[PDB]
Design a protein around this nucleic acid. Structure first.
Lengths: 381, 381
RNA sequence: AGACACACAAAAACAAGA
């Protein structure tokens, strides 16, 4: 009895092959800070380096995190992991280069644009500010960038240049970050693998990386924290999802999650970096499961009601919301009657539970009205 | 049955890697006290050393704690722990340097600023005064700095220069301390690892470090001292938090706490020094748990009612406050009826308990009114 | 022959006392 359903899955197990071969060029320049400042000046003017973009951003990376040290960079875990991923790093000794145009190897638009010609930490932290809401688009991305700038200035950590706060500048930074994989990956690796010794700039990087965890993968968090639960008897299934309708869907989700598992420590950033198997965690491929999980999560988490969802999911999400609210009131009643001893703690615990549920209800309605207002202003635009 | 929920956690276990490579330069100068006084004069004038900042503050550190001894400094536990963290220490022999500008290796603003040109213990103790309230911002930071200066003058320990008490000077010191990791870490290490032999200055350092314990980590103290308790049967769960709503949240908090455990003796200063896993102890990631723990703590500790919290937490915190007050009156009634022997001690113990609860109620209301008044003046600003 | 659908969507520093 050969397994037929494996033909539904064999397309998602590449057995770890090697395809990538990118010629990323490294620069050894005595005027390291000078060329880095030139790169920053080029970027703030909205200049697209294209092919040179990877090299320039890697130069900024090595300057800020290794102080122009190449021996340690090429043996760093970033370098080894990109060895696995298929990135080639080679060093070019342009020691006497002073102008930015000297180091660059279809160049005509770039050359014509360049005719117009710890700040590195400022630039890298500003780029990292885009990570938490990078995949949601550009509107919310720049909104959260502005919020992060305001909160960081309020904490007194960093005071950014005023000109960087212009809408065009964040648009350029969003474009350059979305189009470049190396900037993302180095930022996430530095945020994740740093243990101690953070300055202000590395602290901002680490905070942005932590906020970027599971960005664009809300389905993963919702399903794992609101449907599949580990008890003392192993993993259990949510009572609301025992139907085959979503049972097969959960089986498919488990398959996709196991496929995503092989990526490793960077699995939470799979949507940010577009890793393999990320398209198998799509909302479209799990419509009912996504709607049910999001409804249950909204029932638990008040702030989760602010998520905007497609119009084909709203009714199911609201139904799951109401159902899960009822089952949770049921479960709190069961726990109160089961675990306690006498009537006094029954009454005080149930009064507290009623107050907490009322507070969550009010907060959920407020955030739902806020989401309605946001959709209204977006439609009016 | 592979563990799926490990994909929710693999991003927070770096397996102790090495990323940092900072070129911290050490200075061997015969005019050690002279260059240190020059550094102090530069700082009091609000001069930002930037790159030279780490070297200058390390020079002050080695002067005050080792009397310009480099052999013991480079083998000190600070040096070894920074070996692990990825700091490189190299010595430069600028023996004949007299002007501050001689020892410094984008320098133009710094050079132009420098054209305008046991006090070391005074400077270091003044900096350490900022540690207890460093992460709360600048307002409360300078307020507690002023309070500490007043109390230390009253004890007769130290009499600071009057010009250092100007608002601009504490602002500069707050900026220099917040932007520099090395100053923090050396201050905390000296405060923690000192056993005896404190002079006045090291005594101030140790007192500030002790007051800095768990700064910005009030959630940790509240959860560990008001929710999870060790009985003779191991750790127990608070009756108010047996709901799954916060049960999963406590599981996540336990995960984050275990992640923070690997840091070691500097775990209480994780928020101060921005260690790894500090962003996993966020209030946002544990809204209900943070509000409940803070409410319970306020019910126990009267002075804890003065904490300012976000507007989305106030109702839940007050509900937890009232509930915990009721459960504690319940528990005192149980203990009095259970552990005692006859009626006389029942009556006197219950009268004392009633008086104590009334006193705590009055103090909590007073501090709540004080917090209201503080918020009122802050809003009026 | 084939026939559909399928980016993302929220929140997220700290807060007292000593």
């Amino acid at each position: 009895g050969m397994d037929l359903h494996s033909l539904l899955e064999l397309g998602t197990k590449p057995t770890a092959p090697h395809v990538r071969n990118k010629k990323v060029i490294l620069f050894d320049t005595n005027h390291q800070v000078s060329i880095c400042n030139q790169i920053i000046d080029a970027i703030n003017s909205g200049i697209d380096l294209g092919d040179l973009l990877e090299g320039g951003l890697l130069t900024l990376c090595v300057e800020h995190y290794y102080n122009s040290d190449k021996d340690k960079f090429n043996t760093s875990p970033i370098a080894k992991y990109l060895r696995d991923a298929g990135y080639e790093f080679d060093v070019i000794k342009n020691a006497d280069a002073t102008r930015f145009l000297d180091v660059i190897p279809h160049y005509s638009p770039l050359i014509l644009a360049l005719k117009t010609l710890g700040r590195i930490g400022l630039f890298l932290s500003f780029c990292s500010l885009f990570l938490p809401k990078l995949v949601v688009g550009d509107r919310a991305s720049i909104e959260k960038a502005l919020r992060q700038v305001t909160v960081h200035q309020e904490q007194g950590i960093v005071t950014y240049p005023n000109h960087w706060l212009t809408t065009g500048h964040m648009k350029v930074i969003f474009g350059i970050l979305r189009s470049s994989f190396i900037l993302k990956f180095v930022l996430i690796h530095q945020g994740v693998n740093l243990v101690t010794g953070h300055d202000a700039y590395d602290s901002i990087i680490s905070n942005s990386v932590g906020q970027t965890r599971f960005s664009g993968l809300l389905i993963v968090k919702t399903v794992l924290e609101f449907i599949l639960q580990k008890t003392d008897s192993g993993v259990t299934l949510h009572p609301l999802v025992r139907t085959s309708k979503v049972k097969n869907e959960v089986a498919s989700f488990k398959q996709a999650l196991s496929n995503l598992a092989r990526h490793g420590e960077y699995a939470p950033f799979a949507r940010v970096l577009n890793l393999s198997g990320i398209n198998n965690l799509e909302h479209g491929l799990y419509p009912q499961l996504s709607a049910i999980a999001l409804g249950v999560a909204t029932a638990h988490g008040s702030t989760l009601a602010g998520v905007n969802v497609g119009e084909q999911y709203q009714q199911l999400r609201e139904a799951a919301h109401d159902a899960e609210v009822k089952l949770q009131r049921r479960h709190e009643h069961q726990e109160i009657q089961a675990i306690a001893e006498d009537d006094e703690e029954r009454k005080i615990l149930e009064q507290f539970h009623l107050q907490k549920t009322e507070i969550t209800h009010s907060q959920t309605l407020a955030v739902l009205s806020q989401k309605r207002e946001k959709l209204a202003r977006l439609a009016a635009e």
